[PDB]
């Protein structure tokens, strides 16, 4: 049988959140210059000259 | 080449000339003492006249 108010029911949920899918588009990023670049030794590559 | 001695290792950066730290490797006298004027000449500042 069809009982109205025990088939009720009240359900709980969030409001007005928005959603994003990509994530490293609001970085943005540069390299320092290329000659003054250093490896993990903190000592620099291509540097024989 | 003319002592059998190795290349070099030259940072770009180093401060010393590689006349610098050629007089303090090899051994002769003749040519040490030529790399010693070199480095060590320089213009007299006087006033005259």
């Known amino acids: 049988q069809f009982d109205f108010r025990a088939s009720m029911h009240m359900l709980t949920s969030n409001l007005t959140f928005t959603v994003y899918s990509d994530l490293l588009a609001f970085v943005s990023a540069d390299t320092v210059e290329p000659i003054n670049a250093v490896a993990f030794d903190n000592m620099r590559i291509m540097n024989e000259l | ?49």
């Not at chain 2, 059998?4 to 007089?23: K, L, S, V, W």
């Not at chain 2, 303090?24 to 006298?29: G, L, P």
């Open chain 2, 1 to 49: 080449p003319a002592f059998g001695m190795q290349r070099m290792h030259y940072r770009n950066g180093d401060p010393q000339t590689p006349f610098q730290i050629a007089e303090q490797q090899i051994q002769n006298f003749q040519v040490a003492n030529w790399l010693h004027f070199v480095n060590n000449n320089q213009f007299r500042q006087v006033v005259i006249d």
